[PDB]
Amino acid sequence: MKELKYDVLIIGGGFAGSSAAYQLSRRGLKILLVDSKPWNRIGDKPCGDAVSKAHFDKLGMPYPKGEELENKINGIKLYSPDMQTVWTVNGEGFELNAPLYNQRVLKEAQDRGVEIWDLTTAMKPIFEDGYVKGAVLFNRRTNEELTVYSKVVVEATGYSRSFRSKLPPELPITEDLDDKDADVAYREVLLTKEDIEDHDYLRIFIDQETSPGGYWWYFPKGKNKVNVGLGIQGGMGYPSIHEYYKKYLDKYAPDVDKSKLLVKGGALVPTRRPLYTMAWNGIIVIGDSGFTVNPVHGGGKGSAMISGYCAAKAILSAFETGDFSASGLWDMNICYVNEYGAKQASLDIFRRFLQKLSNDDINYGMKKKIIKEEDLLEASEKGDLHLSVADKAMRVISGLGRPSLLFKLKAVAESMKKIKELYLNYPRSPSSLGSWRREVDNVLTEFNKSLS
Ligand SMILES: Cc1cc2c(cc1C)N(C[C@H](O)[C@H](O)[C@H](O)COP(=O)(O)OP(=O)(O)OC[C@H]1O[C@@H](n3cnc4c(N)ncnc43)[C@H](O)[C@@H]1O)c1[nH]c(=O)[nH]c(=O)c1N2
Numbered sequence: 001m002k003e004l005k006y007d008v009l010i011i012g013g014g015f016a017g018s019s020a021a022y023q024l025s026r027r028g029l030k031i032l033l034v035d036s037k038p039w040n041r042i043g044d045k046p047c048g049d050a051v052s053k054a055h056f057d058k059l060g061m062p063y064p065k066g067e068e069l070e071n072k073i074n075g076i077k078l079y080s081p082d083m084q085t086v087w088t089v090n091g092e093g094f095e096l097n098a099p100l101y102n103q104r105v106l107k108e109a110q111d112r113g114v115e116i117w118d119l120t121t122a123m124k125p126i127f128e129d130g131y132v133k134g135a136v137l138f139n140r141r142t143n144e145e146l147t148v149y150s151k152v153v154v155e156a157t158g159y160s161r162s163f164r165s166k167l168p169p170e171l172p173i174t175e176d177l178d179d180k181d182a183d184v185a186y187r188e189v190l191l192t193k194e195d196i197e198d199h200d201y202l203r204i205f206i207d208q209e210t211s212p213g214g215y216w217w218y219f220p221k222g223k224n225k226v227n228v229g230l231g232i233q234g235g236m237g238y239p240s241i242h243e244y245y246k247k248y249l250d251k252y253a254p255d256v257d258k259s260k261l262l263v264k265g266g267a268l269v270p271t272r273r274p275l276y277t278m279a280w281n282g283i284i285v286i287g288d289s290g291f292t293v294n295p296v297h298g299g300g301k302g303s304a305m306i307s308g309y310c311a312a313k314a315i316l317s318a319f320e321t322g323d324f325s326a327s328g329l330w331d332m333n334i335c336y337v338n339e340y341g342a343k344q345a346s347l348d349i350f351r352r353f354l355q356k357l358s359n360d361d362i363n364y365g366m367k368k369k370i371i372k373e374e375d376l377l378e379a380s381e382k383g384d385l386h387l388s389v390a391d392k393a394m395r396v397i398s399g400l401g402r403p404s405l406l407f408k409l410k411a412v413a414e415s416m417k418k419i420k421e422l423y424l425n426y427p428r429s430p431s432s433l434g435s436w437r438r439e440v441d442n443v444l445t446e447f448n449k450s451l452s
């Protein structure tokens with residue numbers, strides 16, 4: 001078969017792969033990005049389509065504009081399970097036309113010299129002499145099977161992790177996703193019968209019964225159009241997400257016009273710390289394939305962008321040292337853990353605690369304002385549940401006279417702080433990965449056991 005040589009092969013062109021291509025462009029390298037989808041569909045995986053402005057600012061990434069920006073968001077309304085307490089959290093963000101924005105990023109990367117092949121699937125890794133060395137591709141437009149050799153593969157295949165899962169199972173970058181570390185999620189976009197109230201505010205409904213392990217949402221995409229959906233925890237034996245959706249849609253979106261459904265669909269969403277290493281010999285893994293998603297709220301487009309940025313920085317470093325080993329690419333880990341990964345690890349612990357609370361606990365916590373809106377904001381953006389904030393909360397929790405997991409909040413905060421510091425001490429080279437991973441696994445197991 002035909003053989004081509006590139007410096008970098010990016011497999012997948014969603015927020016993660018497109019970010020990597022954009023960030024790597026015009027830096028002297030010969031880059032190819034492939035995606036199984038036709039051009040006009042790249043970017044269209046089901047999603048709530050909400051991304052903070054702070055994520056774009058973190059990276060100085062261009063804002064969505066024109067038809068890419070369906071609706072400007074000025075904050076979130078968070079609802080207690082009993083619907084009696086609503087916390088309004090202010091902050092700027094965007095409700096995107098995700099395919100349009102994602103396609104605009106790709107078009108700009110292409111304009112800056114990135115080669116992009118759509119309708120093209122990476123079928124098989126080239127793994128030789130202990131390194132990822134490229135991929136066998138199938139290009140549906142040309143009905144050609146081709147081999148592309150690359151110094152580095154950027155695996156950005158989304159939740160399917162379709163390329164890295166075909167690698168030798170002893171490699172650390174083949175790390176699999178436990179069922180309980182992901183949610184399944186489903187959404188629809190519908191027009192509404194009436195103008196949406198406060199259409200610049202997203203609505204998130206906490207309820208352990210109608211969306212066990214996740215939450216329901218109502219995300220306006222304009223004055224009369226909404227993205228509504230839910231996520232539920234995987235691996236718990238829950239019935240189909242579609243049973244919850246049918247049963248409770250009317251509670252959260254009484255105003256949708258069901259005769260005016262525009263799109264619908266679901267996908268898996270990882271909800272955990274990132275891959276223990278996102279780099280290995282000849283390969284970096286980013287976005288959902290590397291578990292980049294916020295474990296508490298399931299937001300992965302902003303962090304997908306961050307992982308793309310870190311991949312680019314690590315690759316440029318590798319070319320400047322001629323070193324495509326895991327050691328040569330290791331700054332990918334150092335970058336990503338400092339930008340977002342350490343926060344994710346802390347939030348992985350926090351999510352485990354939140355998933356085990358009852359509706360009565362959450363109604364009580366929110367009613368009594370056990371933490372303020374300012375502190376919930378600080379905790380979601382940095383991963384920090386300050387010990388003083390946990391103390392103040394525990395002073396309110398001490399006035400509860402029934403058994404509750406809420407009483408463990410201080411212990412949770414301590415475990416969050418511990419895991420965060422462990423991640424901020426991420427191993428400086430691959431020879432230490434094993435030792436450190438065992439310390440993490442130890443923190444997690446101890447923590448899982450502390451909740452009984
Ligand atoms: C229902 C629902 C709701 C939400 C969310 C998820 C879900 C399922 N999330 C998460 C967010 O959608 C997700 O984390 C990012 O879109 C993932 O971006 P990636 O680029 O990693 O994967 P993504 O899945 O977008 O892209 C991967 C690409 O790889 C291609 N591909 C896969 N295998 C391939 C192969 N072998 N060869 C070639 N191409 C291949 C695919 O065609 C695809 O285009 C979210 N996040 C958020 O920020 N805001 C939100 O509101 C929500 N809400």
Ligand SMILES: CCCCCCCCC
Pocket residue numbers: 048050051052053073074075076091092093094297298299300
């Ligand atoms: C202000 C907008 C913040 C982005 C919301 C992300 C949560 C989506 C799963």
